[PDB]
Design a protein around this ligand. Structure first.
Ligand SMILES: *[C@@H]1O[C@H](CO)[C@@H](O[C@@H]2O[C@H](CO)[C@@H](O[C@@H]3O[C@H](CO[C@H]4O[C@H](CO)[C@@H](O)[C@H](O)[C@@H]4O[C@H]4O[C@H](CO)[C@@H](O)[C@H](O)[C@@H]4O)[C@@H](O)[C@H](O[C@H]4O[C@H](CO)[C@@H](O)[C@H](O)[C@@H]4O[C@H]4O[C@H](CO)[C@@H](O)[C@H](O)[C@@H]4O)[C@@H]3O)[C@H](O)[C@H]2NC(C)=O)[C@H](O)[C@H]1NC(C)=O
Ligand SMILES: *[C@@H]1O[C@H](CO)[C@@H](O[C@@H]2O[C@H](CO)[C@@H](O[C@@H]3O[C@H](CO[C@H]4O[C@H](CO)[C@@H](O)[C@H](O)[C@@H]4O)[C@@H](O)[C@H](O[C@H]4O[C@H](CO)[C@@H](O)[C@H](O)[C@@H]4O)[C@@H]3O)[C@H](O)[C@H]2NC(C)=O)[C@H](O)[C@H]1NC(C)=O
Ligand SMILES: *[C@@H]1O[C@H](CO)[C@@H](O[C@@H]2O[C@H](CO)[C@@H](O[C@@H]3O[C@H](CO[C@H]4O[C@H](CO)[C@@H](O)[C@H](O)[C@@H]4O)[C@@H](O)[C@H](O[C@H]4O[C@H](CO)[C@@H](O)[C@H](O)[C@@H]4O)[C@@H]3O)[C@H](O)[C@H]2NC(C)=O)[C@H](O)[C@H]1NC(C)=O
Ligand SMILES: *[C@@H]1O[C@H](CO)[C@@H](O[C@@H]2O[C@H](CO)[C@@H](O[C@@H]3O[C@H](CO)[C@@H](O)[C@H](O[C@H]4O[C@H](CO)[C@@H](O)[C@H](O)[C@@H]4O)[C@@H]3O)[C@H](O)[C@H]2NC(C)=O)[C@H](O)[C@H]1NC(C)=O
Ligand SMILES: *[C@@H]1O[C@H](CO)[C@@H](O[C@@H]2O[C@H](CO)[C@@H](O[C@@H]3O[C@H](CO)[C@@H](O)[C@H](O)[C@@H]3O)[C@H](O)[C@H]2NC(C)=O)[C@H](O)[C@H]1NC(C)=O
Ligand SMILES: Nc1nc(=O)c2nc(CNc3ccc(C(=O)N[C@@H](CCC(=O)O)C(=O)O)cc3)cnc2[nH]1
Ligand SMILES: *[C@@H]1O[C@H](CO)[C@@H](O[C@@H]2O[C@H](CO)[C@@H](O)[C@H](O)[C@H]2NC(C)=O)[C@H](O)[C@H]1NC(C)=O
Ligand SMILES: *[C@@H]1O[C@H](CO)[C@@H](O[C@@H]2O[C@H](CO)[C@@H](O)[C@H](O)[C@H]2NC(C)=O)[C@H](O)[C@H]1NC(C)=O
Ligand SMILES: *[C@@H]1O[C@H](CO)[C@@H](O[C@@H]2O[C@H](CO)[C@@H](O)[C@H](O)[C@H]2NC(C)=O)[C@H](O)[C@H]1NC(C)=O
Ligand SMILES: *[C@@H]1O[C@H](CO)[C@@H](O[C@@H]2O[C@H](CO)[C@@H](O)[C@H](O)[C@H]2NC(C)=O)[C@H](O)[C@H]1NC(C)=O
Ligand SMILES: CC(=O)N[C@H]1[C@H]([C@H](O)[C@H](O)CO)O[C@@](O)(C(=O)O)C[C@@H]1O
Ligand SMILES: *[C@@H]1O[C@H](CO)[C@@H](O)[C@H](O)[C@H]1NC(C)=O
Ligand SMILES: *[C@@H]1O[C@H](CO)[C@@H](O)[C@H](O)[C@H]1NC(C)=O
Ligand SMILES: *[C@@H]1O[C@H](CO)[C@@H](O)[C@H](O)[C@H]1NC(C)=O
Ligand SMILES: *[C@@H]1O[C@H](CO)[C@@H](O)[C@H](O)[C@H]1NC(C)=O
Ligand SMILES: *[C@@H]1O[C@H](CO)[C@@H](O)[C@H](O)[C@H]1NC(C)=O
Lengths: 358, 137, 404, 97, 48, 49, 49
């Protein structure tokens, strides 16, 4: 097994304040396939200056996705207090074919500091944390969100300078406010910008160390890190799983200013991922130094046929979701974004079973 | 070009002989159609076309510039891929495909050939030119 | 064939274009005309090869420790490496090695996007239960190979001197895996999917303690509720450990960088053979074509550039250059034949004579066997197209005449 | 008025373009059908031979053959139809001249 | 409606696109035929 | 699908596909023939009017 | 076992020729004479048509 550093030596976790009301925002950013949102590039090849249909895993046109936002924690002046999170840990989703994530979309805009609605601040990009696995259930106190056996954790760290991916057994700690102890609400990760986000030496273990306060890491099979250059550029992240393992996709290493996702890593995770959740993150900033963080959006993938417009440089800038509506079906049947005027027959609206008889 | 496939293709009888003969016959029919049509458009007698033909009636768009002005415009406004009758083989090697789905360069890849028409442009123009000069008389 | 059956006359159908014409009509007597025949094929004058050359595929994990049970098989996924099956197989006494949807010769010689090796302890006495046609416990609840990918199954015994592989106390497997729905009346068998683990793996321990052991887990609402239940069974351990190895290969989800180790020569480079027709094998992608140096298009990281017909039309080489790939275009051939004179000429439609009395260039291509006469006809029997005509000399060579 | 009449509202003109497009469609059938696998593991005979042995190799090649034979038959049938159509039409032009 | 069949149908290329386009063209031809015919039967002048 | 697994299931489905593709091709070919026929015939009606 | 000929036919049909290849062979290696085999026997020793 892989050595992932020492256990936390703290007798207690930081209390986590869950107030979902503050996170119930409506900032819709649906997939716009005409801008090629959420598209994972054909994996074994490229094309140049053509329009073709392609079968692959894509988000639905118009899908709003699930929005998640991270926030500053509680504070009194220069002393950070408890963490402030949404009810994300108990919100366990079905993985299905995987998902894509819109990250930092609101960056540079003026937004709200979630913990204090009256306070606005420039929005900064923050990376999502995920917990994925094959089996889920409750913690000792009955709250949902516990993953059993080997769990894949995708945990950004170093104030957004690295992504750490590890596959390990999470053994909940029994200390105060920990998942197997008393006064448990939710686990959460955090960093403290005052000591962790120095201009020079960032603490590359800040979010890992906080994670370790809630769980002991046991029987780890791997722990990989990937380096992220700091910027405020909108980016896409994706995850899928095949017989080869878990594939991590990102736009930032190939199409940074475009958004097409390319595979950057394969993880040796062979058990089937069925469930995932968002690991809530709370930033332990001081009261006078709260930032607004961009929300991220998770969209589910499914095997769809898309019409993909490849530029001369090979990037996909425009696409059609062939099953979205009747007009989309028309463009896909002609493999073109430009079709003639006329009255065309398209696929019938299928009736679906509303039940069964036996 | 795969010998293994050719071996299996032989089990379908004289398939390619039928394809080749059918297209040969169709292509001959097209040449007979053209030869017959132009034999009939052809005038036995005609007046020379001179600039000013038509008098008060302006027929300069019909006069040969050779094709007429309206005839050249008709061809120029229609999008036609150049089949490369004289050296398309070379053009597709030196320059390559004009665009995606280039059906002319595909000839030497897919294994098909576009054949030239029975008459060239100048001869076809000669027939409609002499036809024009015969109308009034 | 004569009446008496002897062969007195024959045509070699591949000798020339006129011979091809007679064979297509199955006759020694064909009509005058201009006929299309098989194109003059271009032949490769060489070959180019590019493969990943580097680290070999590491089968070390397989050789160390106690192998897992069939339901806990371990998976080694190989990408971007040089593989050698013999180097693995030579360490074991192979009892069975069969392939499906790939030839035996190919499994050891082809390039793959990936090669997946699933290894586990497995009694040879249950050999048949790994068959695709099997309806026993193993194919239903433990391990099943893919139906969509080419696969091989290897059963082998660990030699006494291979002391790095240790034995479990017994072989074990799942003989039952099912869910009890929340109604607690209906039991639904949970069959293993190809290349996946059974859902009961989480309730069944690494070794079944006793044959008949029953396992159960309460499922959460997120899991559909109800119970997951399973039963295990065992097979007594043999003198030498018997193992199964499942190999699955994929052929085009990535650069096919899982290849045999090839010693490279500098006569198989692309840059050294530009403009020529060559056979190529580029990270498992193969065919015939002509490479040319040209402007880079498409995404560089994806290596292979395809057109709208899914042909390979461009390639980014490891030498840093981008090449355009053109098919080895063939030269069109038409036979100009005169039945009365028994003479002929060859037309290479749309071909400059630079590639062919010698060759004569005409408006319809290059002709060989025609003599330019500056003669006019109206009565043309062998039109070449445009306003050209082949005019028989009557015999001599056919003349190239214009139609008046 | 006819000098500038070669537009999208000119039916005779559009028919000229359609005739040209029909020629292109006939060729696109041959060019694009070669990329089809018709159920085979590959549209490339060389790949099939590279991957399979004769008892299975023949079956995969045979799928490509039947697909391609079908394409050529369809192509020829349409050329015969289009040729006959044009031949009839040539008579009509003769009558109009 | 079976996804498994649709997966196999894709191996035959753009089959349904060709079927739909061919019938669309034929159906347009029929409308052009009617429009043309009636344009010619139409009288310029007529008695009630 | 109910009765067979993929290696055989594909073969059986493929038979139905080839049969149905053949039917649709035959249908389209006849509609094109009948359509052309009617179009010619429409001209004849025009001439008779 | 027979391939591409029925069991009933092998003993009852007429042939241009019948070729019989005989050799010593351990029954324990039975499976390595299979057409699907990738072991030593089918690769380097003996393969049927
Ligand atoms: C894929 O993976 C497989 C498996 O790893 C690779 O297959 C191996 O390939 C190597 C060659 O690269 C091959 O090695 C050859 O072995 C023979 C056999 O000799 C043994 O018996 C004699 C008995 O007299 C011993 O004297 C000899 O030492 C060997 O004994 C072995 O076993 C005993 C236990 O019983 C041990 O104690 C020994 O230590 C030893 O392990 C050798 O005769 C042969 O030698 C020739 O080649 C070597 C190359 O280095 C050279 O140095 C020698 O001088 C000699 O070369 C001369 O003769 C050859 C003609 O044979 C001529 O071509 C040269 O020019 C010289 O004139 C060599 O050592 C090994 O057996 C293979 N193993 C298997 C299982 O197949 C495969 O290559 C890999 N494929 C790829 C693409 O990578
Ligand atoms: C929050 O605010 C920050 C700025 O503070 C935004 O970051 C900028 O985002 C834009 C758009 O993505 C970036 O612009 C792109 O820069 C690329 C490279 O720039 C370097 O190289 C060029 C020379 O090639 C130099 O002139 C330049 O100074 C840099 O050294 C260009 O290649 C891009 O052009 C390509 O895409 C466009 C659009 O499709 C095409 O028209 C072009 O032809 C070409 O294909 C483009 O110009 C900009 O560089 C980023 N700046 C920084 C500091 O990061 C964040 O995006 C914004 N966040 C959100 C969510 O809005
Ligand atoms: C996937 O992940 C799940 C969830 O973590 C695992 O299931 C858990 O397995 C552990 C055991 O490893 C269960 O914990 C305890 O196991 C005891 C087994 O007894 C044997 O072993 C102990 C030493 O550990 C010996 O002393 C003993 O003599 C036996 O040899 C049980 O006895 C324990 O029972 C206690 O709790 C129950 C109430 O639940 C009381 O009724 C008992 O009296 C006693 O106090 C206990 O069960 C753990 O509970 C399991 N969790 C769940 C949710 O089922 C899977 O094993 C893992 N799968 C794989 C393949 O790794
Ligand atoms: C921050 O997170 C990183 C993970 O991203 C984590 O990295 C781990 O550090 C430990 C050391 O603390 C590494 O463990 C060593 O690995 C080397 C490999 O060559 C071994 O040789 C070492 O063995 C010696 O030390 C052991 C101490 O337990 C002895 O038991 C042993 O006998 C030897 O004397 C040791 O195993 C580990 O490999 C990395 N892991 C990764 C994935 O990089 C880092 O520790 C974290 N930092 C903090 C402060 O938490
Ligand atoms: C007979 O009819 C033809 C047209 O079919 C007349 O020729 C046309 O004359 C006009 C003069 O106003 C030309 O217009 C010019 O067009 C150019 C652009 O090409 C523009 O730059 C000029 O400023 C001007 O507008 C027109 O092009 C020309 N057309 C052709 C085909 O030649 C001809 O004059 C008539 N003859 C008689 C005797 O009436
Ligand atoms: N901390 C924080 N994070 C954020 O991401 C954030 N975002 C916003 C702004 N978010 C948004 C998102 C979308 C639209 C918007 O214009 N939506 C369209 C509808 C788009 C559609 O449905 O197609 C609208 O008209 O409302 C406005 C604000 C404000 N404060 C923030 N504060
Ligand atoms: C990318 O494709 C477009 C076509 O979609 C190419 O544009 C055509 O170029 C030819 C040759 O100059 C013109 O005859 C066409 O009229 C153009 N069509 C359109 C719609 O503009 C374009 O040149 C291609 N770009 C590259 C780099 O190959
Ligand atoms: C976590 O919070 C979310 C969001 O407030 C809850 O989801 C909502 O549930 C209500 C019904 O109680 C629905 O009307 C809303 O439409 C849901 N919102 C969304 C975005 O889905 C969720 O149930 C809570 N989960 C837990 C475990 O408390
Ligand atoms: C996780 O790793 C440990 C070794 O670090 C495995 O072995 C157990 O380790 C604990 C703690 O030292 C001992 O108390 C047990 O007695 C050990 N058991 C055995 C069989 O050696 C442990 O089995 C691993 N867990 C999993 C699920 O693989
Ligand atoms: C990812 O980023 C880290 C941090 O910049 C890199 O680690 C540094 O590597 C240099 C060169 O060996 C050392 O001098 C530094 O001391 C290292 N810093 C730390 C904190 O370890 C790491 O190499 C990068 N990884 C990759 C693949 O580029
Ligand atoms: C989630 C929550 O309870 N937020 C409350 C905050 C926090 O208590 C402080 O930010 C502590 O640092 O205080 C408010 O007065 C504010 O700032 O608007 C009211 C707001 O509702
Ligand atoms: C879930 O809640 C029940 C409450 O009765 C408890 O017994 C059970 O142990 C909890 N699950 C876990 C994994 O602790
Ligand atoms: C194991 O190795 C020894 C030499 O160390 C050798 O004498 C013995 O025969 C080998 N055993 C087997 C089964 O090959
Ligand atoms: C090319 O290969 C030959 C061996 O056949 C070697 O002697 C020569 O040095 C090589 N040249 C280059 C440039 O690699
Ligand atoms: C290909 O062309 C580029 C310029 O576009 C040139 O730099 C490069 O050296 C050429 N490569 C070869 C092999 O000629
Ligand atoms: C034949 O010769 C004449 C000159 O006598 C020349 O003008 C004509 O182009 C030549 N024809 C061909 C096909 O070269």
């Amino acid at each position: 097994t892989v050595d992932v550093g020492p256990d936390s030596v703290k007798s207690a976790c930081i209390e986590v304040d869950i107030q979902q009301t503050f996170f119930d925002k409506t900032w819709p950013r649906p997939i716009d396939v005409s801008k090629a949102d959420g598209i994972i590039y054909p994996q074994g090849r490229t094309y140049s200056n053509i329009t073709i249909t392609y079968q692959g895993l894509f988000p639905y046109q118009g899908d709003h996705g699930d929005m998640y936002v991270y926030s500053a924690g509680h504070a009194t002046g220069t002393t950070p207090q408890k963490l402030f999170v949404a009810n994300y840990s108990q919100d366990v989703k079905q993985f299905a074919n995987g998902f894509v994530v819109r990250i930092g979309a609101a960056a540079n805009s003026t937004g709200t500091v979630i913990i204090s609605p009256s306070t606005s601040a420039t929005i900064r990009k923050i990376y999502p944390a995920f917990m994925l696995g094959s089996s889920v259930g409750n913690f000792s106190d009955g709250k949902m969100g516990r993953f059993f056996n080997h769990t894949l954790v995708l945990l950004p760290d170093g104030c957004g300078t690295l992504l750490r991916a590890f596959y390990c057994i999470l053994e909940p700690r029994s200390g105060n406010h920990c998942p197997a102890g008393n006064s448990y609400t939710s686990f959460a990760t955090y960093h403290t910008p005052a000591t962790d986000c120095s201009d020079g030496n960032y603490n590359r273990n800040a979010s890992l160390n906080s994670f370790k306060e809630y769980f002991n890491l046991r029987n780890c099979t791997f722990m990989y890190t990937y380096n992220i250059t700091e910027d405020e550029i909108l980016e896409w992240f994706g995850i899928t799983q095949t017989a080869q393992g878990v594939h991590l996709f990102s736009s930032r290493y190939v199409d940074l200013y475009g958004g097409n996702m390319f595979q950057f890593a394969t993880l040796p995770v062979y058990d089937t991922i069925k469930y995932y959740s968002i690991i809530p993150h709370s930033i332990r900033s001081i009261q006078s130094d709260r930032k607004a963080w961009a929300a991220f959006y998770v969209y589910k993938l499914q095997p769809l046929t898309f019409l993909l417009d490849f530029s001369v440089d090979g990037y996909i800038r425009r696409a059609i979701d062939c099953g979205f509506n009747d007009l989309s079906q028309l463009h896909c049947s002609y493999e073109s974004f430009d079709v003639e005027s006329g009255v065309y027959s398209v696929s019938s609206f299928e009736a679906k079973p509303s039940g069964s008889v036996v | 070009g795969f010998q293994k496939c050719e071996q299996l293709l032989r089990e379908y009888g004289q398939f390619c002989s039928k394809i080749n003969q059918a297209l040969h016959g169709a292509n001959l029919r097209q040449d007979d159609s053209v030869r017959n049509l132009f034999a009939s458009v052809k005038s036995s007698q005609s007046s020379p076309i001179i600039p000013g033909f038509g008098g008060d009636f302006n027929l300069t768009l019909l006069e040969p510039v050779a094709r007429s002005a309206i005839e050249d415009l008709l061809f120029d406004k229609v999008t036609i891929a150049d089949p490369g009758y004289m050296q398309g083989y070379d053009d597709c090697m030196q320059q390559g495909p004009a665009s995606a789905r280039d059906l002319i360069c595909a000839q030497y890849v897919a294994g098909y050939k576009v054949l030239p028409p029975l008459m060239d442009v100048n001869m076809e123009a000669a027939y409609t030119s002499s036809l024009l000069g015969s109308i009034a008389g | 064939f004569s009446v008496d059956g002897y062969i007195r006359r024959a045509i070699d159908c591949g000798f020339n274009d006129l011979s091809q014409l007679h064979c297509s009509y199955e006759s020694f007597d064909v009509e005058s005309g201009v006929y299309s025949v098989s194109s003059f094929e271009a032949k490769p004058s060489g070959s180019v090869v590019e493969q990943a050359e580097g680290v070999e595929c590491d089968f070390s994990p397989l050789l160390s420790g106690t192998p897992p049970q069939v339901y806990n098989f371990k998976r080694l996924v190989f990408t971007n490496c040089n593989y050698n099956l013999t180097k693995l197989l030579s360490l074991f006494s192979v009892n069975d090695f069969t392939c499906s949807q790939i030839s035996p010769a190919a499994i050891a010689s082809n390039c793959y996007s990936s090669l997946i090796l699933d290894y586990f302890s497995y009694p040879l006495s249950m050999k048949s239960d790994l068959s695709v046609s099997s309806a026993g416990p193993i194919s239903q609840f433990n391990y099943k190979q893919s139906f969509s990918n080419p696969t091989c199954l290897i059963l082998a015994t660990v030699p006494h001197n291979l002391t790095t592989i240790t034995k479990p106390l017994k072989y074990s497997y799942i003989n039952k895996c099912s869910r009890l729905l929340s109604d607690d009346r209906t039991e639904v068998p949970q069959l293993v999917n190809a290349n996946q683990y059974s859902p009961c793996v989480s309730i069944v321990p690494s070794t079944v303690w006793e044959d008949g052991d029953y396992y159960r887990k309460q499922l959460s609402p997120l899991e559909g509720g109800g119970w997951l239940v399973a039963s295990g069974s065992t097979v007594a351990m043999t003198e030498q450990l018997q193992m199964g190895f499942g190999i699955t290969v994929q052929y085009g989800t990535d650069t096919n960088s899982v290849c045999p180790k090839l010693e490279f020569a500098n006569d198989t480079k692309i840059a050294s053979q530009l403009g020529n027709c060559v056979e190529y094998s580029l990270y498992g992608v193969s065919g015939r074509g002509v490479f040319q140096n040209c402007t880079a298009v498409g995404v560089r990281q994806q290596r292979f550039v395809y057109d709208a017909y899914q042909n390979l039309v461009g390639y980014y080489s490891d030498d840093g250059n981008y090449y355009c790939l053109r098919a080895c275009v063939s030269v069109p051939v038409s036979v100009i034949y005169d039945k009365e004179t028994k003479t002929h000429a060859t037309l290479f439609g749309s071909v400059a004579c630079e590639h062919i009395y010698g060759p004569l260039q005409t408006p319809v291509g290059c002709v060989l066997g025609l003599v330019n006469s500056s003669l006019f006809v109206e009565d043309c029997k062998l039109p070449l197209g445009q306003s050209l005509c082949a005019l028989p000399d009557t015999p001599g060579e056919m003349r190239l005449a214009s139609i008046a | 008025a006819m000098q500038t009449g070669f537009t999208t509202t000119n039916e005779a003109f559009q028919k000229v373009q359609d005739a040209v497009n029909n020629n292109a469609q006939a060729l696109s059938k041959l060019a694009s059908e070669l990329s089809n696998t018709f159920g085979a593991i590959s549209a490339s005979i060389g790949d099939i031979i590279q991957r399979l042995d004769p008892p299975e190799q023949d079956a995969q090649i045979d799928r490509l053959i039947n697909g391609r034979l079908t394409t050529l038959n369809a192509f020829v049938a349409q050329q015969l139809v289009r040729s006959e159509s044009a031949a009839l039409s040539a008579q009509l032009a003769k009558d109009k001249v």
